[PDB]
Amino acid sequence: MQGGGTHSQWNKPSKPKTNMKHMAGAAAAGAVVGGLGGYMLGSAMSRPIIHFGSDYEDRYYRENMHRYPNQVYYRPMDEYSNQNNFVHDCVNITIKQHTVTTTTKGENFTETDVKMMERVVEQMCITQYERESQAYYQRGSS
Numbered sequence: 001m002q003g004g005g006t007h008s009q010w011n012k013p014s015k016p017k018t019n020m021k022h023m024a025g026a027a028a029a030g031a032v033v034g035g036l037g038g039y040m041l042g043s044a045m046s047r048p049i050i051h052f053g054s055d056y057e058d059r060y061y062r063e064n065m066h067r068y069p070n071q072v073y074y075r076p077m078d079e080y081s082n083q084n085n086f087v088h089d090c091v092n093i094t095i096k097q098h099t100v101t102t103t104t105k106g107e108n109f110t111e112t113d114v115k116m117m118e119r120v121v122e123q124m125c126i127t128q129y130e131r132e133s134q135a136y137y138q139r140g141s142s
Contacts (some may be wrong), residue, residue, distance in 0.1 A: 010045055045071075
């Protein structure tokens with residue numbers, strides 16, 4: 001539940017504003033695709049925790065790290081050039097399944113929780129996509 005609202009007794013004037021986490025451009029544009037039927041999960045990968053710009057989040061990572069989505073669904077090295085778009089839509093789905101399921105099972109990843117996953121995952125989907133990318137460079141092709 002989130003009420004979708006936000007109110008309460010006059011907020012007691014606490015400390016002033018300071019430096020907030022900085023984004024990173026927009027990372028939000030076209031999203032065309034083609035059609036499902038291409039999501040195969042490779043193996044589990046243990047990658048360092050991600051970073052957003054706050055100590056609170058970092059803590060969350062250390063809190064559910066062992067629970068941090070350590071797997072990623074995606075289309076095998078087979079591709080043409082959409083390597084960044086592949087991972088992109090991959091974590092999008094790896095998260096779509098772990099998020100909807102968190103819900104299908106009754107769990108609930110907090111918006112933060114999900115950001116964590118989306119990065120760590122996109123990082124995982126890329127990590128393996130890379131390891132295999134090289135495996136392809138050696139696989140017959142030079």
